[PDB]
Amino acid sequence: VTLCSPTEDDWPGMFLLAAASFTDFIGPESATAWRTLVPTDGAVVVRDSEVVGMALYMDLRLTVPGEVVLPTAGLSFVAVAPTHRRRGLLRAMCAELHRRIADSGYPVAALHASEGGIYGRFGYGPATTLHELTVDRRFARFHADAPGGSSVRLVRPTEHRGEFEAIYERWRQQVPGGLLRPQVLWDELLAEAKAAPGGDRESFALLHPDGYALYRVDRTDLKLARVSELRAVTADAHCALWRALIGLDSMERISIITHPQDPLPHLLTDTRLARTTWRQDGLWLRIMNVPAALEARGYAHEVGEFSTVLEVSDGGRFALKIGDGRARCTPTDAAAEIEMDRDVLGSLYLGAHRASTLAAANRLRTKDSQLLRRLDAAFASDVPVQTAFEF
Amino acid sequence: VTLCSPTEDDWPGMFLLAAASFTDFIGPESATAWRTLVPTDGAVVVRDSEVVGMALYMDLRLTVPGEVVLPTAGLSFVAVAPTHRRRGLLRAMCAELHRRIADSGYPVAALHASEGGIYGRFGYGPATTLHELTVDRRFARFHADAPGGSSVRLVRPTEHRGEFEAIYERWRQQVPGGLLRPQVLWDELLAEAKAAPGGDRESFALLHPDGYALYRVDRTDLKLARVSELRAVTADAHCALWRALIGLDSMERISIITHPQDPLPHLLTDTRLARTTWRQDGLWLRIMNVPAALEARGYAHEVGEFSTVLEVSDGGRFALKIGDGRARCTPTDAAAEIEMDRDVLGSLYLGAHRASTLAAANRLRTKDSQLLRRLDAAFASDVPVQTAFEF
Amino acid sequence: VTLCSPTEDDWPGMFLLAAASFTDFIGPESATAWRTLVPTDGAVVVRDSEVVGMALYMDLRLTVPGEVVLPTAGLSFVAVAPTHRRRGLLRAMCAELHRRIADSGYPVAALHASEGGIYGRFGYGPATTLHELTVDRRFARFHADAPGGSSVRLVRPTEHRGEFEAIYERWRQQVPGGLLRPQVLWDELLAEAKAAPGGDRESFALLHPDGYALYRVDRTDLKLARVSELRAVTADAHCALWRALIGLDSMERISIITHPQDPLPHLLTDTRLARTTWRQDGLWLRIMNVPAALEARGYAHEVGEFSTVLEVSDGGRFALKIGDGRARCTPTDAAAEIEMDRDVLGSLYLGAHRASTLAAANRLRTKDSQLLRRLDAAFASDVPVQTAFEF
Amino acid sequence: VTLCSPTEDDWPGMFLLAAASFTDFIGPESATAWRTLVPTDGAVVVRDSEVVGMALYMDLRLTVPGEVVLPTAGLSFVAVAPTHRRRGLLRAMCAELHRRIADSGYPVAALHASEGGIYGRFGYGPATTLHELTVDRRFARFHADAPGGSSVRLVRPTEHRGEFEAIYERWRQQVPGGLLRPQVLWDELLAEAKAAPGGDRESFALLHPDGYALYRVDRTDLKLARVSELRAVTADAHCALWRALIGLDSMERISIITHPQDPLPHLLTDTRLARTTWRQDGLWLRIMNVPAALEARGYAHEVGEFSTVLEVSDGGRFALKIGDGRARCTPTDAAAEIEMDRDVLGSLYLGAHRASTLAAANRLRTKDSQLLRRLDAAFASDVPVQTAFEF
Ligand SMILES: [Cl-]
Ligand SMILES: [Cl-]
Ligand SMILES: [Cl-]
Ligand SMILES: [Cl-]
């Protein structure tokens, strides 16, 4: 058992481990495309010789509150062979990548979790919430107040790549959780848009000047349309796209994986028709550099200037001053007023979780209820946090 | 078709309509107990002579943000005979009760909705959110940070009525959505605690000095425990009760109908184990007197003093000034800065829905994005809004 | 093994065999009430001493085409002990009862079959068709042409016995398949109308001057109302009762066991909403006396006078002359033009099955296609055949 | 929004709308084959430029009672874009095609309905009934009377095209509902006979001189054989094919979409084994020219000569004289004795629905019960109405 950066000769062994580890493995051709987002020294492997462990990160750009874009290490392709469980391989690989990520100057790392119980101990907190809405469209009537009572076109996704790219680029820059989508991921997305023999049905697009929806009929439930992606830059675009989706008269149900503040239910005369059928953690964040991350994002202007001392468990103690929507975060040995593990700060960082809620679980410790209210207000995001694409 | 306050002789006919209308009808004996909460002139019936329509309200006490308790008209027992649909009987009965409620001096009316599409047009907005969590307790491990790593007793509910009453009374006064639970509803609750032949299994209680949980094994799924009610006045009590529930080793799953900010998931090493299995509107509010309701509740201290002009569609136009956690709301003919239907104000009132989200659906109209942020912040509740008991 | 008429002392042993044989056994008290319809010498038992076989008939009145009422032997309570299978006990009991029924002067015997494969060989043919319609009432809109766009009352069944009795008596006299419902069966029907602990929910009635519907919410599916019985003497009553049933706004679905010519689907803008969810043989007929049965019923006036020779396999050969809606059926040794087993004549007798369809299965043999068309037309019923009550 | 006959350049846009509208879309290659049945000016499109609406008709030959073959406009490929709902596009397209169909000299139009609630208002009535029978073949025993107690061969469909074509041509000419099946539809049918990767299993044929059955094992239920098509010209062929299907010893169940008068159940000792698992409207008819359609079909010889006056709502009033199996239908201003909407006449026309049943729903209005009986008898079909192939 040695831990190394993989050579070109290691990648066939990594693809075997991937195929055996991930039921959703994209195959070697697609994986080779995703590889283009992994920097030199972005990957580690454990050899016994065959590959028994692997982990890597990709260079991402993540939007945080205040429309600030952070360089982000996106952890992915993490696997330990079923032959090598309970040997500390995950711990060793995560320790090495975190060392490389921190030394490289990334203020944050991010991942999507295979299970909810693994990444908390490595300092990752769930930072976005996936919210599945299922609409019984047979009953759906738009409210008198709903915009645009057409601006929308039914199109083939592959024929309107430029328009989707431009709309997505506008969306990702204005929404916390937004990720830059590089050209290789557009190539991959539009390749998946076509039907597969015994696989997915053909994808269609609804295109508005200021939004698009990509959807396909479910493989097995032929009365369910699944929206894979809806990106709307305006309220008018969001409503117009939903009027078109409710117009899919051959379907009983439209489902979408969205965010908790999706205004869809409020567009209907019966809010209950937009049923929450599933909820899960989306993007997870590890704050690598506490002061750099905390100084980088914008804060709520509504809360008056306040100062506190924040201790992150084995992450430093800082004088934190928040006023006029900006934070200053400097080293101190002054007594801590707030204490939390690193994972908890990740959960607060995009505004998806309230300091008050985490305090009620004793994940966040303070003796000052006023300070808790100020933190809740300051860390809150004006623009609701969304999830961009899984990686 | 005439609309009257019912005489004693009308109640057998009302109980027949109830039995035929409500699959969960509590029967004449329990209904006669609930009747004690209906004031003189609190009920209307339509006769054709037999009862073809009915509606009533009960005298309730509702806690709103700032621990303020409002007299509240709780609409209930609303039915139109299947023989008399589409004759405007619901509209006529709701118009008459609203007249009586407004003239009686109630600032707010409330109900639980049989369907989501009916009460919006009568000025009711959904004001609390029911959130069902299902825990696979076989996997549940408490976080190192979780309080109290016993203070809890397994007891017969009927033997500890005084302790439940006292804990509930503390809870309902400190939580927005809290309702006073009169003696007749305690009588009814503890009568339901015993097992029924071919019906519900026996209810048990977990009792802490500062909280209780009432639960029973599901009728048909013998590996599911359903928590009917958990009232905790402290974080220590909430965690202690959940440690005890996760200790129900004969169960696979524990389910509870709770609120979106329940800290349960954060008590576990795997937040994903507390799965959201169901979400629905809970309590609905109709603001009867806009200035009385808006002046009565407390507002967030974090937001700086601001002034605006609010128009409620056919509900008046008001100069609204919010500062130091209090509102002043006076008549004006000045140009409106914010417009919304009455139902929308109900949805904002307990802090369950953000002004920003309702604005994105065009249910709330303003040209000022700064004003929207200030409203979001001001109307937000420090203590998360919960649902008390169904009526 | 001896075959006897039971003594009073035999009935406890018959009730044990019944409980072990019939999952729907009505119990000794209800069975003692049904006993009042069994004539002296109407029952046989086989003893080994304990009861190992039983069979009986009740005195019924069956309506046949032309509003003619026939005395009918209703076979029921037929059981062989699981200890005594394949010993010819059913054959022996059926042979003896048929001897008694024939000698008593009954022209027809009838039964409801536990299985479809048993009674054909004893000369019983399925004579009515049960047709279950399930309406998704959330979508149901009445056609512009539908009558009565209220005459209907929601009532407690036990309070309107006289009105149900009178409506049913009018119905049973005008519909082929109609049975006289004696007072003991009204006593039993209204006793079942009340709810049972862990059993059926409360029954309700919709009452029109010229029709009624008895319905209850399903035990387990709380969004399904099951109509146990709808008797309408006019088209106006039938439509009015269905308008009321579609008005059960708490239900998703209304189901009824009806007949294939129920006009319900044609009352709706979408005929497809009245879905056929189940179909089965209803009443079975054994023609005991061929000439008496054939001379007794009315025939279609549309078909011109014709003569043929009918042979029933081991049931006689007859010169059959049909004209002006009446048949003459006299002994002959002339060559047969039509041959069929006795069971086939039972299937033709109420007009539920076409001679042409049975001929296509070679259950009915003729070389004359014109004769087949004349038989189809003559045996057809003006009033569609319905099923009264199970016995 | 303009309505035009499509140019060659419009068909890619029509195929996109088809793919997005029809989950069973046959793809561009098969659709191009079906196109060969669409006459010049047989198609309309709405452009906004992209295709947002389309509809066409094909030249068909439909068999009606009396073995009469009518030129028939088969409406198909009808779609409105989900972006253009509730804009009257369907009404506009149907009005234009009906104008073209009427002017072209078609006496009838026909379609298969995506939903049951749409085509009634455009004058289409459901005219055939689809009846799914599922046989539990493990229990199925043929009756002593059943023919042919082998004449049948198990063959590859593609190797016996000539024999299937010849049998089908005999069938379609003798059965009301029969359609001529052109060479392009035989090409398409035999292409679907082969297995597809992750798709349908291989089709097999059972071939008799006077009948064939095409069947395949269900994709997912490997104990279910689905008969896609059984065409039998004789009772012997029908029974022989069913003996062979019941001989599929690896199956639990055989299912077929047949007609209500299928004699299959009567071939078995247990009629109940042939269970009706599904029922739906099949072919829909719009009578374009009332007198031409009514004079064209044969009527029952059994009913004596009679005269009446029929009014079709906005379809004319006619003196209708029916005798010796023929109708004369001439213009009159004499008082109407029968009134009905055009859709109702379509439902009566192939004998699938009784005038009496439609009268009970008030879809057919007369004050003369004798006239109703005569219409029932006259419009009845000697040969039961069947459904040919979906289009
Ligand atoms: Cl999202
Ligand atoms: Cl709650
Ligand atoms: Cl019936
Ligand atoms: Cl058919």
mmCIF file of C-alpha atoms and ligand atoms in Angstrom, chain C residues 129-130 171 231 257-259 385-388, ligand 3:
data_model
loop_
_atom_site.group_PDB
_atom_site.id
_atom_site.type_symbol
_atom_site.label_atom_id
_atom_site.label_comp_id
_atom_site.label_asym_id
_atom_site.label_seq_id
_atom_site.Cartn_x
_atom_site.Cartn_y
_atom_site.Cartn_z
ATOM 1 C CA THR C 129 -73.318 -10.311 -16.331
ATOM 2 C CA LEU C 130 -71.818 -8.280 -13.435
ATOM 3 C CA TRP C 171 -87.706 -1.891 -10.059
ATOM 4 C CA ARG C 231 -82.183 1.029 -8.084
ATOM 5 C CA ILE C 257 -71.276 -3.498 -9.709
ATOM 6 C CA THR C 258 -73.799 -2.836 -12.511
ATOM 7 C CA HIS C 259 -74.811 -4.383 -15.906
ATOM 8 C CA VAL C 385 -81.016 -7.868 -17.942
ATOM 9 C CA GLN C 386 -79.736 -6.816 -14.461
ATOM 10 C CA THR C 387 -78.674 -8.744 -11.295
ATOM 11 C CA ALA C 388 -80.965 -8.176 -8.240
HETATM 12 CL CL CL E 3 -76.976 -5.262 -12.226
#
